[PDB]
Write a protein that holds these residues in place. Structure first.
Motif, short mmCIF file in Angstrom:
data_model
loop_
_atom_site.label_atom_id
_atom_site.label_comp_id
_atom_site.label_asym_id
_atom_site.label_seq_id
_atom_site.Cartn_x
_atom_site.Cartn_y
_atom_site.Cartn_z
N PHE A 160 0.32 -7.25 36.49
CA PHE A 160 -1.01 -7.82 36.37
C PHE A 160 -1.87 -7.44 37.57
CE2 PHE A 160 2.17 -10.69 34.65
CZ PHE A 160 1.82 -10.68 33.32
N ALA A 190 -6.62 1.15 25.80
CA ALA A 190 -6.75 -0.22 25.34
C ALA A 190 -5.43 -0.83 24.91
CB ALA A 190 -7.73 -0.28 24.18
N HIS A 191 -4.42 -0.02 24.59
CA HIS A 191 -3.16 -0.57 24.12
C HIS A 191 -2.41 -1.25 25.24
CE1 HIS A 191 -3.14 2.50 20.59
NE2 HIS A 191 -4.01 1.52 20.42
N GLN A 192 -2.30 -0.56 26.38
CA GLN A 192 -1.61 -1.13 27.53
C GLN A 192 -2.36 -2.35 28.04
OE1 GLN A 192 -1.26 1.36 30.93
NE2 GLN A 192 0.46 0.22 31.78
N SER A 193 -3.68 -2.27 28.08
CA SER A 193 -4.49 -3.39 28.53
C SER A 193 -4.37 -4.57 27.58
CB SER A 193 -5.94 -2.98 28.66
OG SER A 193 -6.48 -2.79 27.37
N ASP A 194 -4.26 -4.31 26.28
CA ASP A 194 -4.19 -5.42 25.34
C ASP A 194 -2.84 -6.11 25.37
OD1 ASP A 194 -6.67 -5.65 24.41
OD2 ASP A 194 -6.48 -4.05 22.91
N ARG A 195 -1.74 -5.36 25.46
CA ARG A 195 -0.46 -6.06 25.54
C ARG A 195 -0.29 -6.75 26.89
NH1 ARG A 195 3.41 -3.03 28.31
NH2 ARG A 195 2.96 -0.79 28.45
N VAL A 196 -0.81 -6.16 27.97
CA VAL A 196 -0.77 -6.82 29.27
C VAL A 196 -1.70 -8.04 29.28
CG1 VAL A 196 -1.43 -6.44 31.68
CG2 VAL A 196 0.09 -4.89 30.57
N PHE A 197 -2.79 -7.99 28.52
CA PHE A 197 -3.71 -9.12 28.47
C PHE A 197 -3.12 -10.28 27.67
CE2 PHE A 197 -7.33 -11.36 26.60
CZ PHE A 197 -7.96 -11.76 27.76
N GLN A 198 -2.42 -9.99 26.58
CA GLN A 198 -1.75 -11.06 25.85
C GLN A 198 -0.61 -11.65 26.66
OE1 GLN A 198 -4.52 -11.05 23.90
NE2 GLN A 198 -3.09 -12.10 22.52
N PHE A 205 -0.67 -11.76 29.83
CA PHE A 205 -1.32 -12.51 30.89
C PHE A 205 -1.79 -13.86 30.40
CE2 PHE A 205 -5.01 -13.70 33.43
CZ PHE A 205 -4.46 -13.64 34.68
#
Ligand SMILES: CCCCCCCCCCCCCCCCCC(=O)OC[C@H](COP(=O)([O-])OCC[N+](C)(C)C)OC(=O)CCCCCCCCCCCCCCCCC
Ligand SMILES: CCCCCCCCCCCCCCCCCC(=O)OC[C@H](COP(=O)(O)OCCN)OC(=O)CCCCCCCCCCCCCCCCC
Lengths: 54, 140, 319, 119, 46, 347, 55, 459, 98, 102
Positions: free
Chosen positions: C73, C286-294, C296
């Motif tokens: 994160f 966006a894929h890495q950011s989206d799975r890291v955001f979920q 998070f």
């Protein structure tokens, strides 16, 4: 992840001051992000008075 | 203006020829004055002689459209002998579009101008014939 | 917040918490040499509230829990990987650079609020101006392509031109071999593995570019190597100067009001962090950011506004 | 359609609107307004990062009350408006009946239509 | 408990919540009184 | 600035609009427009960049020459039939210059060049107040002088405004020029109905003002200027995405959504005349301006762009402005299809 | 030949290129002020004496 | 009807206030109970339509299509997993609730008395479908597909609004009965020609006809299975439904002014069946099959025979079922091998063995299987158009030959001859897939038994 | 009409052309706006005096005090431009392009 | 020297088998899998399909069929009993017409 997403080149296609190029588009530039241009570049001149021998 | 379009629609269509062509060249002169006025107002031609050339080009193209369109209007109405069909003006609008494309010296601009100018000229005569009111009622 | 216009209308000014106690001092040395020894001394003998060094997990320890969040994160800096391999083209230098820049800017804004309210003035250490000096010298070693240097230049153009430069900067000069001896006698192995010409470029730019380009905005105090502890000298030199230069003469109330409302709502500060220019070392799909955001949102504190957060409490979600 | 003898300004409900009945309680349009107020409170929870469907129940009650109240008075104005429109129309109908002809109800024994068979 | 140095709100104020509940209940009672007056005015006029 | 000073200046902008709405004397109308200009200048240049200086300069020159041309129209009116009653004029020339004064005032296609220039170079609050109030108040003037208008004026300016505000907007990637082009498009829709049933125009005015307030509050969710910043608004918040979706399609005006009530009733009580070619042409260009709404939607709320770290750093912090009035205007601007019989709320 | 290439040229390409060319002629205004006021002036004069609005 | 609308409203917050790993069963069970209560509608008899709640009425132009929508919903609700199970909870619930709101505007469209209410619910049918295909298209031109989609459907269907408003304030109200029982025959001046051409051109856009048809196949092949099935079946058969309603006016001119669309429709039918003879990308063939059937439907509506209308509504219902199923088989093959092309996934008789039974059954219902509803529809269309003119039967039979040919090509090329033996990821077929095969091919065979339910109101 | 009114309106429209087309400086443009103010002043004044319409004699003096403060706002803006550049040309406004 | 990205090659193509070999088509939770097969293969077939089949099997005379059979039988018995011609033309009486003349 097997579903297509737009890329760097798409989100740079949505760039420049215009979307569509012209035969004059080489003069427009995207604005600064403070919306502040470099201010004067010819900044100041405090006055230099020569009170002479009069 | 109202005066010259009224001169154009005064003559029966019908065979009272070449007055139609002169009125259509007046239409061309007015359209060229409009386009040339805005174009030299929003360019800075640098210099004025080239601005005269640009204005002359636009007025000559618009007047040529008017002249060729009036000629083919009158000729088609005399040949087909039916002063009520819009198809003669369909042919006229396509002919005007092709000559616009040829003075601009292209092909695709000429063909698309043929299609759109023909359909819009058909709409013009079709609405003038059945009766569609000019620009307002303004009543209710 | 109990602010907006109404606080300035009812509560009179903020001029009254000034001055000669409340101030901005900033101690800047080279790496691991002028450290929080001198900063804790001037804090404890000048009556002036301290803020620590701006590492990486300050964003972790600044809100909610102070337990630091893992590097998936709050990264992906990997500082010891930067000190070991500042040459790998996988992207490990500039990412860390911009993250440290945001860290410095965040703690600078927070210290500016803690100056503008209650006092008592703060000591910063390794502030933002040293950070553009770090990018300059890091490019002198030739670690980053010139395009990305220009990107950091643009971030520096937009961000720094909204603030006030601090009152005083205590430059501390420690020479090459002494810093090198301290870092090779500290013990951290990935700090043991550092190079020396990078330290030399820090010295060269940090002399020749910082100190001319202050010009009495940020009144400087240049100190030698062993001029530390040695505390009464820096205390008497801070006390016995007079402040006549820099934009901290006159504000009077309006500028200070605007800075008080600009420091609050910290996303106002952070609106100009992402430009974006698209920087093939920086952007993330966006894929890495989206799975890291979920994932998070799956952290037990961060999910939907820790002021209201369930499963810690606070038994008042209004029935 | 201007005045209509406004003397007597905009006058959010005039004196004359008290002769028609008001909208009833649980009329469906004010119920729609109440649901829209509920959705307003729910998206109000959604803008800030407070949890949705909780932690805003007093704000739910306030938004529902505000919208139902305002929409109630607007429905009263609407009923006044349509009543006075029909009253003006039928008054001018009864004014000059001789200029509005009542046409003859011809039966289909005499109304002829041109046929044109669809094949 | 578990929070460090910044609950900015969420510690519930009690001025505003009581004010909202009071003005909303008052607004309901006013509209119901209004509707009863309208019904009785209507059956009085007709 | 002081907050005292801004509350005074906003009170004077309100005062100018109330004087324009309220009076029966032509000098009071002119003083109202002038006072509105005088106070609305220092809402611009809240910062001090040269962008705002040039923008306020252009706005001042166009606005002041519009006000003096309006005073010329009043003075022609009293060179003819001499009384200060705000009513039917007594010269087609006076009505001509008066409509051209308003067409320079609130932006129509011969006179519209200043609008995107002035809306880009300012912050969003100044743009909000200028679009909403400066396009509210002169519609009152048109509503008071409707019986003496040559319809060719409003027809030409309206059609040309719709098509220019349509065709501008395919190229602009800046948010503010998009919003100003949308403004000229709705000025065409709000002006072409005027000589037929002005209740439509005033309801369209209320619709447009509510829509544009929603739009500028959503662009004050964080200070965004391009579309790329809105892709980052996706990455930092999920609900701003779906509200940009719904309000952008309501600016587009689709029948399940409340931005269709302006088109629908206006086509109705437009074609209970027998102007049909003009409504269908207006509705085709109304199909045209929906494209840049649609490409903004496709840019942010429907696809997902690549994004940037330090948004990880932005995840911790709240987006802790106060939104001025966001939720009420959102669900009152979008879900208000089944209340088109609140047309007749107006008169 | 019939579906893909000609139908995509005649309905999407023709309309799309026409609107794009009208955009590149309208919004391509150099940022000067004398030009815009000359547009205002000729609009006034062409509305008075040529295409009349005062009748 | 309002008892069929209001539980579809209350079914929408179901997915919201159900927790995770529990939403699925709830939505399936409850939408199927709605499907039972839907089939309870069928009260229609004899003289009139059944008309109530003044906005609402049901013909037998509306009863079978309404049951088709309220039965194709839960089938789709089950159908659209394995491609968003790994997506998040929020977007999952949003997807499901968007489909439910799509169903609500569909039923509002199908029970529309007033044609302005019909047009509003028409473009209300449009607006969620774009969001579905553009957010979950799972390809790279889906963006352009949605853009083309909305601009074609709007700009075709836009002046229809103006013509209907003109009808509204030149005659009186737009009850469909008072559109009927009052319709004066309108003569053949040019304004009547434009009004007819406006209404017919709007629905020509929607069907599509041949000249406006590249609207569809990009939007089909770049869509998720839910949007693809609802799009194909329900949207195109909705366009046909609306044309069947609006054709009751402007009778005595459409004979004179409805020639050239027949010629465009038939030659487009032959060209469409020929263009789907030689493409790759298995997904596209079913889209062009749909264009072939809808061109035949347009011929059926431009002629005005009760034989033609009965064949029209039967062709609508049957091809909705058939093309929806065969889309689902195409999705199953694409989720077996992530290709979307055709010739890569050969074989598949050996492996996935009883998948072959459902390819056979779906392709023979496309073939006009000799008791199938597809054959009944095409047969009565051919009978009625032969009565229209004695020469049209060459194009009809040549359509039949090429339709059988591309159906058989799809059968024996995708699923015949040799496994390509470098694949090794195809599983046995799950129970869900065979469940969807069963849920498609039970109602078609039950309607093959007793079909007099679903023929037109000209019975 | 009269004879004087034609000449005052001719002076007005020539002042309007001088306001609209303008070459290099902005001070001359604002000064032509001041001349247009004078023209409207004189026109309304001679109207009201020839009518002997003594009641609303407020028009000319209040017209001129208001268009005076309009010119004051304009001079503030022009001096702001000339501060933030070297001159007051129509050039230096070439940025913020359309 | 160029990457443009930071994400992983995603995903691992997890076939749902090899971990729950009795599973049905969807996700691996083995209780709700049984619940799903339950709910579709009862409340989709055994109470929906078969009940709809009985419900459309018999229903009233759909579009008034057997009524029309019995009405036609009575009317044709009447018409061939009482001497009158079966299906007389001119369904409306031409005594109730007023044609236009010349
Ligand atoms: C495709 C374009 C369709 C335009 C709408 C159809 C329509 O009403 O056309 C007739 C209309 C005008 O015809 P109209 O409907 O006004 O019919 C004439 C009726 N009187 C004489 C009473 C006025 O034309 C257009 O829409 C312009 C094309
Ligand atoms: C009979 C019915 C015929 C209906 C035809 C409708 C028009 C044709 C189809 C509309 C969609 C066209 C389209 O999508 O064109 C693509 C083009 C953008 O292409 P690209 O270069 O990828 O742009 C990147 C980001 N914009 O997009 C564009 O160029 C959009 C241009 C605007 C088109 C709006 C619709 C037509 C308006 C006509 C007004 C007169």
């Amino acid at each position: 992840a097997r579903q297509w997403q737009p890329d760097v080149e798409w989100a740079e296609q949505y760039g420049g001051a215009v979307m569509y190029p012209t035969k004059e588009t080489a003069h427009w530039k995207p604005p600064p992000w403070n919306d502040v241009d470099p201010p004067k570049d010819t900044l100041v001149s405090n006055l230099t008075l020569n009170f002479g021998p009069q | 203006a109202k005066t010259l379009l009224h001169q154009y629609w005064d003559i029966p269509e019908g065979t009272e020829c070449h007055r139609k062509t002169y009125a259509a060249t007046s239409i061309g002169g007015a359209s060229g004055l409009v386009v040339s006025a805005y174009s030299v107002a929003l360019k800075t031609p640098t210099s004025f002689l080239e601005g005269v050339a640009r204005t002359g080009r636009y007025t000559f193209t618009a007047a040529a459209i008017g002249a060729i369109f009036g000629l083919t209007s009158c000729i088609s109405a005399q040949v087909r002998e039916k002063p009520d069909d819009p198809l003669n003006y369909l042919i006229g609008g396509c002919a005007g579009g092709l000559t616009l494309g040829a003075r601009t010296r292209s092909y695709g601009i000429g063909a698309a101008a043929c299609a759109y100018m023909g359909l819009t000229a058909a709409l013009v005569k079709m609405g003038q014939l059945e009766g569609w009111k000019v620009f307002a009622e303004p009543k209710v | 917040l109990q602010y907006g216009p109404l606080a300035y209308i009812l509560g009179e000014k903020t001029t009254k918490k000034m001055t000669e106690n409340s101030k901005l001092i900033t101690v800047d040395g080279n790496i691991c040499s002028g450290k929080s020894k001198l900063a804790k001394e001037v804090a404890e003998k000048l009556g002036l509230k301290h803020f620590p060094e701006a590492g990486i997990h300050y964003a972790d320890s600044t809100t909610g829990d102070g337990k630091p969040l893992p590097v998936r994160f709050s990264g992906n800096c990997s500082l010891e990987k930067f000190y070991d391999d500042p040459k790998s083209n996988d992207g490990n230098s500039y990412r860390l650079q911009a993250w440290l820049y945001a860290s410095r800017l965040l703690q600078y804004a927070d210290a500016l609020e803690h100056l503008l309210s209650t006092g008592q003035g703060v000591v910063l250490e390794r502030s933002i101006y040293s950070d553009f000096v770090f990018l300059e010298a890091m490019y002198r070693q030739g670690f980053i392509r010139k395009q990305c240097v220009d990107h950091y230049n643009q971030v520096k153009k937009v961000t720094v031109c909204e603030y006030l430069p601090p009152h005083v900067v205590i430059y501390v000069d420690v020479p090459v071999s002494e810093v090198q001896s301290r870092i090779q006698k500290k013990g951290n192995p990935h700090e043991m593995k550092i190079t020396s010409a990078y330290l030399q470029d820090i010295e060269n730019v940090y002399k020749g570019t910082f100190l001319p380009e202050m010009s009495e905005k940020c009144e400087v105090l240049q100190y030698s190597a062993w001029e530390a502890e040695d505390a009464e000298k820096v205390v008497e030199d801070i006390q016995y100067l007079k402040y006549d230069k820099g934009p901290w003469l006159d504000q009077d109330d309006r500028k200070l009001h605007n800075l008080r409302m600009l420091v609050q709502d910290k996303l106002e500060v952070l609106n100009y962090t992402s430009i974006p220019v698209f920087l093939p070392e920086v952007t993330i799909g966006a894929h890495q950011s989206d799975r890291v955001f979920q994932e998070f949102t799956e952290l037990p504190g961060r999910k939907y506004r820790a002021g209201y957060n369930e499963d810690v409490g606070d038994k008042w979600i209004w029935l | 359609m201007t005045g209509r003898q406004a003397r007597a300004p905009l006058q959010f409900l005039p004196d004359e609107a008290r002769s028609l009945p008001p909208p009833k309680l649980t009329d469906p349009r004010l119920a729609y307004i109440g649901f829209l107020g509920y959705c307003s409170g729910l998206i109000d929870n959604a803008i800030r990062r407070r949890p949705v469907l909780s932690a805003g129940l007093h704000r739910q009650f306030l938004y529902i009350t505000s919208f139902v109240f305002v929409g109630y008075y607007l429905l009263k104005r609407q009923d006044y408006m349509y009543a006075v429109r029909d009253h003006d129309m039928f008054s001018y109908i009864k004014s000059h009946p001789e200029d509005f002809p009542e046409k003859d109800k011809k039966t289909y024994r005499e109304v002829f239509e041109e046929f044109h068979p669809v094949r | 408990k578990f929070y460090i140095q910044e609950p900015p709100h969420g510690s519930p104020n009690w001025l505003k919540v009581g004010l909202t509940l009071g003005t909303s209940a008052f607004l309901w009672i006013y509209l119901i009184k209004q509707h009863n007056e309208d019904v009785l005015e209507y059956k009085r006029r007709n | 600035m002081n907050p005292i000073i801004l509350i005074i200046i906003l009170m004077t902008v309100m005062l100018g609009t109330i004087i324009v709405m309220i009076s029966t004397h032509w000098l009071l109308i002119w003083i109202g427009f002038e006072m509105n200009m005088l106070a609305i200048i220092p809402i611009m240049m809240k910062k001090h960049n040269p962008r705002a200086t040039e923008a306020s300069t252009k706005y001042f020159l166009t606005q002041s020459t519009a006000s003096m041309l309006l005073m010329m129209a009043i003075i022609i009116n009293l060179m003819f039939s001499g009384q200060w009653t705000v009513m039917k004029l007594f010269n087609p020339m006076a009505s001509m210059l008066m409509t051209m004064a308003l067409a320079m005032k609130l932006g129509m296609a011969p006179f519209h060049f200043w609008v995107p220039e002035v809306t880009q170079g300012i912050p969003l609050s100044s743009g909000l107040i200028l679009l909403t109030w400066q396009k509210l108040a002169p519609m009152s003037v048109l509503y008071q002088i409707l019986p003496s208008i040559n319809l060719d004026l409003i027809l030409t300016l309206s059609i040309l405004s719709i098509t220019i505000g349509g065709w501008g907007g395919l190229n602009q990637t800046q948010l503010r020029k998009i919003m100003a082009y949308s403004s000229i498009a709705h000025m065409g829709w709000m002006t072409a109905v005027l000589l037929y049933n002005p209740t439509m125009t005033l309801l369209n005015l209320i619709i447009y003002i509510i829509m544009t307030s929603t739009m500028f509050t959503l662009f004050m969710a964080n200070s965004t200027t391009t579309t790329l910043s809105l892709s980052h608004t996706w990455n930092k918040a999920p609900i701003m995405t779906i509200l940009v979706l719904i309000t952008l399609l309501s600016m587009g005006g689709l029948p399940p959504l409340s931005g269709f009530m302006p088109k629908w009733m206006i086509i109705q009580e437009m074609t209970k005349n027998d102007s049909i070619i003009l409504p269908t042409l207006m509705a085709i260009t109304a199909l045209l301006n929906l494209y840049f709404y649609m490409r903004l939607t496709y840019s942010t709320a429907l696809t997902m762009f690549p994004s940037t770290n330090n948004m990880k750093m932005k995840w911790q912090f709240p987006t802790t402005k106060r939104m001025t009035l966001l939720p009420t205007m959102t669900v009152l601007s979008t879900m208000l299809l089944p209340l088109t019989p609140i047309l007749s709320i107006l008169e | 030949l019939l579906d893909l290439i000609w139908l995509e040229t005649i309905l999407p390409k023709t309309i799309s290129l026409a609107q794009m060319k009208m955009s590149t002629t309208i919004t391509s205004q150099k940022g000067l002020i004398k030009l815009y006021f000359l547009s205002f002036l000729i609009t006034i004069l062409i509305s008075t004496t040529l295409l009349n609005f005062h009748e | 009807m309002l008892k069929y609308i209001i539980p579809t409203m209350m079914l929408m917050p179901l997915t919201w206030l159900s927790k995770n790993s529990m939403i699925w069963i709830n939505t399936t069970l409850h939408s199927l109970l709605i499907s039972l209560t839907s089939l309870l509608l069928l009260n229609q008899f004899g003289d009139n339509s059944l008309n109530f709640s003044l906005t609402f009425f049901s013909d037998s132009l509306s009863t079978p299509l309404l049951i088709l929508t309220m039965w194709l919903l839960p089938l789709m609700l089950m159908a659209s997993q394995h491609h968003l199970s790994k997506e998040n909870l929020a977007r999952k619930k949003l997807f499901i609730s968007m489909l439910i709101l799509l169903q609500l505007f569909l039923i509002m469209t199908f029970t529309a008395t007033e044609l302005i209410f019909f047009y509003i619910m028409f473009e209300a049918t449009l607006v969620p479908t774009l969001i579905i295909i553009t957010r979950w298209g799972n390809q790279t031109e889906r963006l352009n597909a949605g853009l083309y989609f909305l601009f074609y459907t709007l700009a075709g269907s836009l002046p229809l609004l103006v013509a209907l408003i003109y009808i509204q304030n030149t005659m009186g109200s737009l009850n469909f009965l008072i559109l009927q029982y009052w319709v004066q025959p309108m003569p053949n001046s040019w304004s009547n020609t434009f009004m007819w051409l406006a209404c017919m051109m709007a629905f020509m856009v929607k069907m599509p006809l041949y000249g406006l048809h590249l609207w569809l196949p990009k939007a089909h092949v770049e869509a998720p299975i839910a949007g693809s099935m609802v799009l194909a079946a329900i949207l195109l058969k909705l366009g046909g439904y609306g044309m069947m309603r609006i054709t009751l006016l402007l009778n005595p001119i459409t004979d004179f002014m409805a020639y050239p669309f027949i010629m465009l429709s038939l030659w487009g039918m032959i060209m469409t069946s020929s263009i789907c003879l030689r493409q790759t990308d298995l997904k596209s063939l079913i889209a062009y099959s749909s264009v072939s059937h809808m061109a035949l439907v347009i011929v059926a509506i431009l002629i005005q025979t009760p034989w033609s209308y009965m064949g029209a509504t039967a062709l609508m219902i049957a091809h909705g079922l058939t093309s929806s199923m065969l889309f689902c088989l195409a999705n199953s093959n694409y989720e077996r091998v992530h290709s979307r092309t055709m010739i890569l996934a050969r074989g598949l008789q050996t492996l996935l063995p009883l998948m072959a039974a459902w390819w056979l059954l779906a392709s023979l219902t496309n073939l006009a299987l000799p008791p199938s509803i597809n054959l009944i529809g095409e047969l009565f269309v051919v009978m009625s158009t032969f009565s229209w003119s004695n020469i049209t039967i060459i194009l009809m039979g040549l359509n039949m030959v090429i339709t059988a040919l591309y159906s058989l090509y799809m059968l024996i090329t995708t699923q015949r001859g040799k496994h390509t033996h470098h694949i090794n990821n195809i599983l046995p077929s799950f129970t869900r897939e065979n469940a969807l095969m069963s849920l498609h091919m039970l109602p078609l065979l039950l309607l093959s038994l007793n079909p007099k339910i679903i023929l037109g109101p000209l019975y | 009409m009269s004879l004087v009114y034609m000449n005052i309106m001719m002076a007005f429209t020539v002042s309007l052309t001088g306001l609209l087309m303008y070459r290099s400086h902005l001070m001359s443009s604002l000064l032509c706006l001041e001349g247009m103010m004078l023209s409207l002043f004189i026109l309304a004044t001679l109207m009201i005096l020839n009518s002997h319409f003594t009641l609303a004699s407020m028009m000319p003096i209040i017209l001129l005090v208001f268009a005076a403060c309009e010119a004051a706002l304009g001079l503030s803006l022009l001096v702001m431009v000339s501060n933030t550049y070297g001159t007051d040309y129509v050039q230096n406004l070439n940025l913020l392009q359309c | 020297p160029t990457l443009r990205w930071q994400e992983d090659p995603e995903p691992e193509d997890e076939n749902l088998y090899e971990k729950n070999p009795d599973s049905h088509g969807y996700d691996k939770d083995p209780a709700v899998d049984v619940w799903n097969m339950r709910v579709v293969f009862f409340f989709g077939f055994s109470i929906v399909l078969v009940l709809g089949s009985t419900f459309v099997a018999y229903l009233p005379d759909y579009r008034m069929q057997e009524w029309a059979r019995r009405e036609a039988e009575r009317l044709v018995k009447y018409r061939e009993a009482h001497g009158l011609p079966l299906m007389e033309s001119n369904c409306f009486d031409p005594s109730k017409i007023q044609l236009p003349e010349d």
